[PDB]
């Protein structure tokens, strides 16, 4: 499987600027980049997932994202493969303090992708923005039947918890007045 | 006394999320006729024939029109976890049901193309939690919930919708997502038959 992401800068304000190139060019060059300051149109993104091996038969496959995150803007910021037919996606809200990993499993016919709800993952913030720059990525284990990520705790320091997932509840595995860089 | 067929020879079939429903009663109808002016590529029922559904007395028959294309015949059957049957259409299991995937040809110039097909491949609800998802699968012989904010042809596929509730419609968000596939040369359509029995009111009869 080759998953890959689609984005859509159509209609984002691209910023311009001049480039003065050698001393030879005549008439400087204006670079147009699709650049959303503060609060402009943010570009779409969707994941899609391909078949490699029988590929001349079928289409890409579409994982859409969970309901929690499409009532507005949002971003894709994690895509991890926790086995041969599984896959985790991290999705997060524009207003950055709810972010989701989603867990979905590979079906013989249509749907392609099946996303149980029930292993949806939820990661708030009521404080400030979720993570450091952006949500930790789950670390799977063998059998891609749980994950230890770094999270905070009640006391405000990230340290690294065990999630299973069916189960709804993580746990710390370390604790202390001090954080967890990266596993 | 002949049932009117009219409404599906003429303008642009609804997609599948929207099908259009014509109900039959007190009427007589010639079916092998109306498929006569298709190209019928596949014809399957369901506790009853297909040539017994062209010849028998009904009290009451519904026939659902959608544009359906041919590639995703696999997705129409109701023992599917298919989009189609999960959010957009699916028949009940309680009476005789008949499925036909038909192709407009040539000779037919009543009925128009749209610009593409388009179907319902996610339509949940997130409630008041702003945690919970329900996924809104829909009943047989009825409409999505989604049918309020999908439109009647999605303009791109993955385009996400929704609508925030009020309490008194459950509070949290109605969300959905479209798909789309590409248009045939000929338009691809799809009806559904459901026939229904009353005690003296055997009313839909072939005609003779
Ligand atoms: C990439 O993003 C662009 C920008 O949103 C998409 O094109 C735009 O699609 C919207 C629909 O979401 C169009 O808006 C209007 O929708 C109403 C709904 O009834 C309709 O009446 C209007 O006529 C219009 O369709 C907008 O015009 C359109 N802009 C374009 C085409 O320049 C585009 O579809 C996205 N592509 C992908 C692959 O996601
Ligand atoms: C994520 O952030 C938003 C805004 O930063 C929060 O929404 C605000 O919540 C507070 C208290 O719940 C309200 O006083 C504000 O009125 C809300 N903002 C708006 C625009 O209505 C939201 O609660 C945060 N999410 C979590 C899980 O804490
Ligand atoms: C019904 O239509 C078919 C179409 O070929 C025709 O052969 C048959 O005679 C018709 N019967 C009646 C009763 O209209």
């Known amino acids: ?183 | 006394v002949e049932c009117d067929f009219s409404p599906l020879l003429s303008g642009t079939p609804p997609q599948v999320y929207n099908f259009k429903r014509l109900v039959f009663t007190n009427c007589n109808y010639n079916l092998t006729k109306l498929l006569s002016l298709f190209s019928v590529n596949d014809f399957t029922c369901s506790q009853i024939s297909p040539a017994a559904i062209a010849s028998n007395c009904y009290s009451s028959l519904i026939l659902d029109y959608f544009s359906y294309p041919l590639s995703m015949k696999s997705d129409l059957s109701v023992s599917s976890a298919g989009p189609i049957s999960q959010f957009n259409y699916k028949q009940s299991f309680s009476n005789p049901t008949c499925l036909i995937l038909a192709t407009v040809p040539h000779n037919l110039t009543t009925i128009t193309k749209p610009l593409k097909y388009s179907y319902i491949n996610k339509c949940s609800r997130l409630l008041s939690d702003d945690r919970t998802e329900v996924p809104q699968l829909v009943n047989a012989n009825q409409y999505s919930p989604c049918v309020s904010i999908v439109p009647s042809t999605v303009w791109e596929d993955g385009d996400y919708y929704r609508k925030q509730l009020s309490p008194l419609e459950g509070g949290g968000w109605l969300v959905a997502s479209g798909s789309t596939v590409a248009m045939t040369e000929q338009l691809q359509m799809g009806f559904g038959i459901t026939v229904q029995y009353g005690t003296d009111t055997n009313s839909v009869c072939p005609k003779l």
Request: hydrophobic residues 35%.
């Open chain 1, 1 to 183: 499987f080759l998953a890959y992401a689609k984005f859509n800068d159509t209609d984002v304000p691209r910023i311009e600027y001049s480039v003065y190139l050698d001393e030879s060019l005549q008439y400087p060059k204006t670079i147009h980049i699709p650049y959303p300051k503060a609060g402009a149109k943010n570009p779409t993104v969707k994941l899609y997932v391909v078949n490699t091996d029988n590929l001349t038969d079928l289409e890409p496959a579409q994982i859409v994202a969970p309901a929690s995150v499409l009532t507005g803007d949002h971003y894709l910021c994690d895509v991890t493969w926790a086995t041969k037919e599984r896959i985790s996606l991290q999705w997060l809200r524009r207003i950055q303090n709810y972010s989701i990993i989603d867990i979905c499993d590979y079906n013989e016919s249509t749907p392609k992708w099946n996303c149980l709800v029930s292993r949806q993952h939820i990661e708030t913030s009521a404080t400030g923005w979720v993570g450091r720059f952006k949500p930790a990525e789950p670390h799977f284990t063998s059998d891609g039947n749980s994950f230890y990520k770094i999270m905070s705790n009640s006391e405000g320091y990230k340290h690294i918890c065990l999630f299973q997932i069916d189960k709804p509840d993580c746990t710390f595995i370390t604790k202390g007045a001090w954080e967890v860089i990266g596993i």
